[PDB]
């Protein structure tokens, strides 16, 4: 079908030598693959649906002139979005980044009952409505 004369390459994919990233920011960084925690000030859950990859925080110092926050870390604002955990781990492995993976924390199903607010002999009865 695919008449292209393919070859065989039985080694793990690795593109660290062709991505142009300096050695300092490959072997010393620590990627963090995680599903962002819900912002506790809001009840919305639309920002907890994709996996992110962020890097370890590094020093920020005050600019002597204006007091602005300065950085020497080129990857400080880098956030990558991935559809699944396996996709994120694949991207980190081929770039030569050491990574920590945190399994998604999903809310457990809860048994809600408006009627329990007015129980005859249980402590779920509320004193105010």
* Residue 127 within binding range of other proteins, rule CB under 8 A: yes
Question: What's the rounded Cα separation, in Å, for the pair 48 and 105?
Answer: 10
Minimum CB separation from other proteins for residue 43, in Å?
A: 17
**Burial environment of residue 97 by CB neighbours within 10 A (0 to 12, 13 to 18, 19 or more):** buried
* Residue 115 within binding range of other proteins, rule CB under 8 A: yes
* Residue 43 within binding range of other proteins, rule CB under 8 A: no
33 with 55: CB under 8 angstroms? no
Interface residue with other proteins, options 59, 103, 114, 123 (CB under 8 A): 114
Residue numbers at the binding site for other proteins (CB under 8 A)? 114-115, 118-121, 125, 127-129
């Amino acid at each position: 079908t695919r008449d292209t004369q393919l070859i065989t390459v039985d080694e793990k994919l690795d593109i660290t030598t062709i991505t142009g990233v300096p050695e300092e920011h490959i072997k010393t960084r620590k990627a963090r693959i995680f599903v962002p925690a819900r912002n506790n000030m809001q009840s919305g859950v639309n920002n907890t649906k994709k996996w992110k990859m962020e890097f370890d925080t590094r020093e920020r110092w005050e600019n002597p002139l204006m007091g602005w926050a300065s950085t020497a870390d080129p990857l400080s604002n880098l956030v990558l979005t991935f559809s699944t955990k396996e996709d994120a781990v694949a991207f980190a492995e081929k770039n030569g980044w050491s990574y920590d993976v945190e399994e998604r924390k999903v809310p457990k199903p809860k048994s809600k009952s408006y009627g329990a607010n007015f129980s005859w002999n249980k402590r779920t009865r509320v004193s105010t409505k």
